[PDB]
A = this chain, B = another copy of it.
Amino acid sequence: HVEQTYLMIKPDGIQRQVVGEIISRFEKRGYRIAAMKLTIATPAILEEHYAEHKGKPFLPGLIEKMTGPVLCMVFEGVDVIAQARKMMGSTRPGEAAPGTIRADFCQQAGRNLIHGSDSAESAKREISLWFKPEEIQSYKLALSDYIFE
């Protein structure tokens, strides 16, 4: 069975103009784009996005870094929630494995280019926060027979 994960290119990904490169990494595995939207993230939606960190001293700083243009995305694939995390790499780019997004593009955790859901529960919540159901698109990849066993 496939699943869907929420991936969001942060303002540093937009401003460094690596959006296409990021998308290509997920397309390369035959992951399907199920939703995609450019918006400007605001403090009120980011408070909900970062709800697990309510009341923590670092939350204002997380929100400030994220206040800016973002690319909201939903990708579909086998085990894609865990696999996208593996592809992003460790929170700290300096600890991330070579070949991951954060190791290949970044230096510090506060500017680590991309967010991805950390669990099935978070993916469901995040997809619902940033997308309406009518924005989630269902279609089948023509190469499905050569992607899925």
Residues of A within 8 A of B (CB): 11-12, 15-16, 25, 28-31, 65, 77-79, 82-83, 86-87, 89, 93-94, 97-100, 103-111, 143, 146-149
Contacts and interface: CB of A to CB of B under 8 A. Distances in A.
Given A87-B98, A94-B78, A98-B89, A65 B106 contact: no
B147 A28 contact: no
Nearest to A144: B111
Given A97-B97, A98-B89, A29 B148 contact: no
Given A98-B86, A98-B99, A29 B106 contact: yes
**Residue among A78, A82, A104, A147 with the most chain B CB within 10 A?**
A147
B98 A78 contact: no
Nearest to A25: B104
Contact of A107 (B93, B106, B148): B148
A105 B12 contact: no
B12 A107 contact: no
Contact of A12 (B15, B25, B83, B147): B147
Contacts of A99: 97-100, 103-104
Nearest to A13: B146
A100 B50 CA distance: 33
Contact of A16 (B16, B82, B146): B146
A104 B16 contact: no
